[PDB]
A paper describes a structure:
For instance, [name](2) did not interact with H3 peptides singly acetylated on K4. In contrast, this domain showed strong interaction with diacetylated H3 (H3K4acK9ac) but not with the same peptide acetylated at K4 but trimethylated at K9 (H3K4acK9me3). Screening against BRDs of the BET family showed that [name](2) interacted with most combinations of two and three acetylated lysines, whereas [name](1) seemed to specifically recognize multiple marks found on the H4 tail. The second BET BRDs bound to tetra-acetyl H4 peptides with about 10-fold weaker affinities, suggesting that the first BRD in BET proteins recognizes the H4 tail. In contrast, the second BRDs of BET BRDs bound either weakly (BRD2), not at all (BRD3), or promiscuously ([name]) to histone sequences and their variants present in this array. In contrast, diacetylation had only a modest effect on binding affinities of the second BRD of [name].
The 61 BRDs in the human genome cluster into eight families based on structure/sequence similarity. Despite large sequence variations, all BRD modules share a conserved fold that comprises a left-handed bundle of four α helices (αZ, αA, αB, αC), linked by loop regions of variable length (ZA and BC loops), which line the Kac binding site and determine binding specificity. The four helices form a deep cavity that is extended by the two loop regions (ZA and BC loops), creating a largely hydrophobic Kac binding pocket.
Residue numbers in the entry: 349 to 459
The structure:
């Protein structure tokens, strides 16, 4: 039940990682590299970084009590992107495309 919803979450994150979505999902695969040129202020702006690899690790370590906790982290990931980046930045458009995939699957999780 919660077990079933957590399995659904794993499939969702699996699809997010799939070749199908790779053209827009790739910036979200790994933590933001705060040592990269231009990101020297990232941690000043973003208090709680999150990325898909970290989410994968947390699912695998059974650190989400339920699908709502999983969803919170996925949304945190997107919101950090919307907060930090200029609203016309290509990465914001990419985030939206990936979020469309997530929201549609997450909505259709049986309950």
């Amino acid at each position: 039940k919660v077990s079933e919803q957590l399995k659904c979450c794993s499939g969702i994150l699996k699809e997010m990682f799939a070749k199908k979505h790779a053209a827009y999902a790739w910036p979200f695969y790994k933590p933001v590299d705060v040592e990269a040129l231009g990101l020297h202020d990232y941690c000043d702006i973003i208090k709680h970084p999150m990325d898909m690899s970290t989410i994968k690790s947390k699912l695998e370590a059974r650190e989400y009590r339920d699908a709502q906790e999983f969803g919170a982290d996925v949304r945190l990931m997107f919101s950090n992107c919307y907060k930090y980046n200029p609203p016309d930045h290509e990465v914001v458009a990419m985030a939206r495309k990936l979020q469309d995939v997530f929201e549609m699957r997450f909505a259709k999780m049986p309950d």
